[PDB]
Ligand binder design. Sequence first.
Ligand SMILES: NC(=O)c1ccc[n+]([C@@H]2O[C@@H](COP(=O)([O-])OP(=O)(O)OC[C@H]3O[C@@H](n4cnc5c(N)ncnc54)[C@H](O)[C@H]3O)[C@H](O)[C@H]2O)c1
Ligand SMILES: NC(=O)c1ccc[n+]([C@@H]2O[C@@H](COP(=O)([O-])OP(=O)(O)OC[C@H]3O[C@@H](n4cnc5c(N)ncnc54)[C@H](O)[C@H]3O)[C@H](O)[C@H]2O)c1
Ligand SMILES: NC(=O)c1ccc[n+]([C@@H]2O[C@@H](COP(=O)([O-])OP(=O)(O)OC[C@H]3O[C@@H](n4cnc5c(N)ncnc54)[C@H](O)[C@H]3O)[C@H](O)[C@H]2O)c1
Lengths: 386, 384, 400
Amino acid sequence: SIYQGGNKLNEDDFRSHVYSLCQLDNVGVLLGAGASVGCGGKTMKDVWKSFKQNYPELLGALIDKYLLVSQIDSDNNLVNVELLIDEATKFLSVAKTRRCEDEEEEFRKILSSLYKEVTKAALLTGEQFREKNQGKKDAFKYHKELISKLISNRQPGQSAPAIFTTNYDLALEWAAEDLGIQLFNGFSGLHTRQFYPQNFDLAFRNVNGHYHAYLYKLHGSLTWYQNDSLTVNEVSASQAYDEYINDIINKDDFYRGQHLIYPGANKYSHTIGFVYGEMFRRFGEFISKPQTALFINGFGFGDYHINRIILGALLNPSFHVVIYYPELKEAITKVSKGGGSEAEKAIVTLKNMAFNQVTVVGGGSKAYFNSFVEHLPYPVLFPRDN
Amino acid sequence: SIYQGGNKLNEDDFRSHVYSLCQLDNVGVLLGAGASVGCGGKTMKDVWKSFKQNYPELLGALIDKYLLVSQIDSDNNLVNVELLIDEATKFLSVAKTRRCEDEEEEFRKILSSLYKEVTKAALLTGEQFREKNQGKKDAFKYHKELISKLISNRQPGQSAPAIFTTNYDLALEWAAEDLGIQLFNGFSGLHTRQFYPQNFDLAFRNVNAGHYHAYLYKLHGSLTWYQNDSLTVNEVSASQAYDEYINDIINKDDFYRGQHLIYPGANKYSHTIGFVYGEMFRRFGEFISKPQTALFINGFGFGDYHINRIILGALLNPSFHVVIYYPELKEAITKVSKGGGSEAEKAIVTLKNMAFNQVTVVGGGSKAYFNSFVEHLPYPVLFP
Amino acid sequence: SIYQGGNKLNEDDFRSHVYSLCQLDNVGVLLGAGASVGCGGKTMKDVWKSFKQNYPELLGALIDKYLLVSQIDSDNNLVNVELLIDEATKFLSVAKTRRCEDEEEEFRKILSSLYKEVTKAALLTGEQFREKNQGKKDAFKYHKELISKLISNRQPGQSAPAIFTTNYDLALEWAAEDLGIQLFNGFSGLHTRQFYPQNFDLAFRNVNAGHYHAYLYKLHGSLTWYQNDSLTVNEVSASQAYDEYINDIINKDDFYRGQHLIYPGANKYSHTIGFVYGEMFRRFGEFISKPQTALFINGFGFGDYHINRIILGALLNPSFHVVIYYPELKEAITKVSKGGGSEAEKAIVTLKNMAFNQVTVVGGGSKAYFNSFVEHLPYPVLFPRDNIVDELVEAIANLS
Ligand SMILES: NC(=O)c1ccc[n+]([C@@H]2O[C@@H](COP(=O)([O-])OP(=O)(O)OC[C@H]3O[C@@H](n4cnc5c(N)ncnc54)[C@H](O)[C@H]3O)[C@H](O)[C@H]2O)c1
Ligand SMILES: NC(=O)c1ccc[n+]([C@@H]2O[C@@H](COP(=O)([O-])OP(=O)(O)OC[C@H]3O[C@@H](n4cnc5c(N)ncnc54)[C@H](O)[C@H]3O)[C@H](O)[C@H]2O)c1
Ligand SMILES: NC(=O)c1ccc[n+]([C@@H]2O[C@@H](COP(=O)([O-])OP(=O)(O)OC[C@H]3O[C@@H](n4cnc5c(N)ncnc54)[C@H](O)[C@H]3O)[C@H](O)[C@H]2O)c1
């Protein structure tokens, strides 16, 4: 629930709040890991569990040789993988300057298998993934709802809603032409498609219908890769499945960064990709807009740049924010005894920030994509005095 | 329980009045000593008592050789270092003109002992004053919140707000760095911090197309406000200030001339070396000449002569409102009626008794403290 | 000895073009290590030489058991100090993970000695670092004048330029703060500092109409910069650093405890300092979106990657203007012919062979002096070109 000075609050207040915020000029939707959980998605903990189960030798070596993770820490349920890739890369640069060969196989296989597992926890449908007609499955219904609601609540003089989703899975570009609404992905042509960031000026206008939305993913894509020519590309899904996913899954060759996405601890250790620059240019250039609203469904509070380029620029009271945090009382009790991770402590700032223009939203599992897109209203035509 | 010019007002009506006033263009402030004193600060009387317990050797001779106060007068608690520093300086100048070596040594001791208690109890952090992370200290949250408020309901086309106070509490910049606020106090720079009028005309702008501000003004000298006595007034960071010329004075019982310019004296003109005054009040009066502008005062007796000489002659401009917080207004009214008051009581009772309504009164004990100031100054509301 | 697109032009046209380019609305400058040699800086070769003199028993064992450097490159002073320090931190963390102490204490002493030999040079004032107003010296005063020459001939509402130099001393802070200019670098505040980066993209303006403001883009960090125990970044007045961590870094022998400081590029692998450093790089790159980006190259070793990454990315710009300052080609051609130069020399000489008219080179021996750079800039017509301040200052000083 919501408390204000020791008095309970009703849901209608928050409903009217979000309705009015949507009525503001600009709006944006942030979508974290919770963007797709009911479609078959899994959290990083499940990825690590599958990684350790598939290759127990790696867990044994970690327990014995180096101890980059402790059993008690895993029991505490705080295992982090984001630091493990960067640890491995720093280790391997050290070895490349040291020339220790007999100890490389362990870590190179660790990289290969970890990337395999991470890429495996996002298809959400297994073999069913490959065939067509998936776009019409009941699983992807809510994405259609969002693709409809916010794309038409745009009277002349207002910009289209912003998409900010940062997960592995593929669920945003398959409800697009199912209902015909293009959440712009920007890849022209039929056979040879190239990525051109200069396509940031797309908008339909009726000259002689008038539907557009805005895509901005803070995760890369499950099908973005570098071909040694300094390029990135997303193409059809089953095409990639039949092309290169099988090679990574089975062959497990000496790993080069076949398809580049950056789930890890330090992004700048992956500074080869400046598209991070563009995406966070957008997300740091949007918070400053006055009379703008942000609907945050799934902000894990774990990443650094997100949690440092939110508060650092909230200091103008015309941009309005709110987050859907499932566990309110449990999280408050946990934080009162020391806090959680390094970045999530920023919640305390919003628990105590000097902006009387927000209020936390929670309740538990009832604040995911489903309710997030269901609780919004539909545009009303022909208002009457009443 | 609130009156103005013969018109009654209640709590809800008072809240509406203060909100409507806050919608006016400009609102001033006086976060008097009754804001940080409660948090652990000390008043001039407490400093006087601390000095009395310290240096227990003069009390016998001074009450006999010079008689600057009697036992009955001391009991009455009618002391004020404001004039006592001036009298000590006059005494010592006489001594130097006449060369009573004992008098010179005695009054050097008097000066270098009296200019310490007012400072060495004005840190509120002990030796931690050289450390960092003191901005996030829980003892200043009040300040933090207030500043945010006074920058939220500031719509475009209205001048920046005014904070006017002088007290020895190093607080406001210890509440502007957690919040990212950027107050201005006429100075500039980390390492070489001095006065610079060119910094009085800076406003925040967005180059592409998160900015907070407010105005600071001190009228007595900050604990880090000093000069090299060679036509060079300087300000210094907290740690360097503790390191260079503040540790010995605290804990070495040595001599002390006017090292760092702090003016708790009364005459404030014998020290014509200090031009600070000459400029700061240039703004205070200039702050109150406007119409449809308010001033807030948090627990002020109005003791100073200069303060009640540009204020009483400010109500002449009609729409200039004014606000005073005073718990024990009855005491001042009675003392004035008894005809035994100083600048403070006379001026306060005069401005309360004026038949006009530009006077706004807040009182009732602790209800006039900083808590009401934080509670009342309003946030904007659009979707209640 | 003037080269401009391969076409020779008279001196009058050269000076006219230089003056016209010197008064551009948009200016983007990236000065190299050698460009500031005349300002009193010390090249990293001297730092390494003094380091080896301090501890000449390290290079042999270093190569023998770590191969961190090649013998020839170290002998010829072709090693990277910041890269070596970062790789030393990498070895140190590896040893901490695997408890390779016999290597941890073999790295600790050399790391602290690198500190002792590098930090001692960046202050530029030694015992006078503890004194205020130290930037008033006439030698550096000209720099302030340049700022005036870069601000006294600028119209209102003009675009913001940016100049980044490899040297990262705090002389800029002392100069600006004796000049009374406020600074928005991220450490906004004075008593308990923090890093607030949004103000990067804001500027000071006058409510009535003065136009004196600059952006402190210290991509390199700076001598004060140190992360305290809290996962944040702070700053200190000069005396704080000069009497709490500069001293042991210069006076005591081996007073090294852990990963604390923010120079040079020390803890990249940790998220915090990575966001501390790379954000300025990005936000500069977040500003080079204009078609008139300007670049300058001087003494680049072609060993870096991220800077080289952006260089390769942006080198395909038809509207790119390049100016190179390197008065060493005459003395380097013979060295290259005899035995061959380094990677940077080969790269630059190969690039020069390209028939591009957008690359300019400035030379002429004595003509490349700092003073000549000062006069080459525009000069106000109405400014009094006479010597009267000196006499008045002397008369005032004589009194009392
Ligand atoms: N060029 C680019 O676009 C770019 C740049 C930098 C980073 N990235 C990507 O952006 C970042 C996003 O990664 P991400 O997957 O961690 O973001 P995320 O918000 O989707 O997930 C963060 C975490 O929150 C957890 N979580 C979800 N629901 C929760 C709940 N109810 N309670 C507690 N925890 C919950 C998830 O298990 C875990 O993913 C990664 O660094 C990387 O994937 C992309
Ligand atoms: N900067 C300058 O050069 C300059 C210029 C003009 C005047 N002055 C000085 O300004 C005048 C005021 O000095 P001051 O502002 O530092 O205060 P003060 O020390 O001179 O007066 C006593 C102090 O005790 C506080 N106090 C006492 N009882 C209180 C209560 N019940 N509630 C709240 N606060 C209470 C008052 O706020 C404060 O005035 C002096 O008379 C005069 O010397 C200085
Ligand atoms: N990774 C880089 O190449 C790079 C580039 C610019 C700045 N920095 C900053 O540089 C470090 C601090 O600045 P600094 O004191 O090292 O100034 P610096 O002048 O030494 O650094 C500028 C450049 O000079 C190069 N260089 C250094 N020594 C060289 C040598 N002996 N021969 C050829 N080239 C050489 C370096 O590749 C590069 O850092 C920090 O790690 C980091 O903040 C690093």
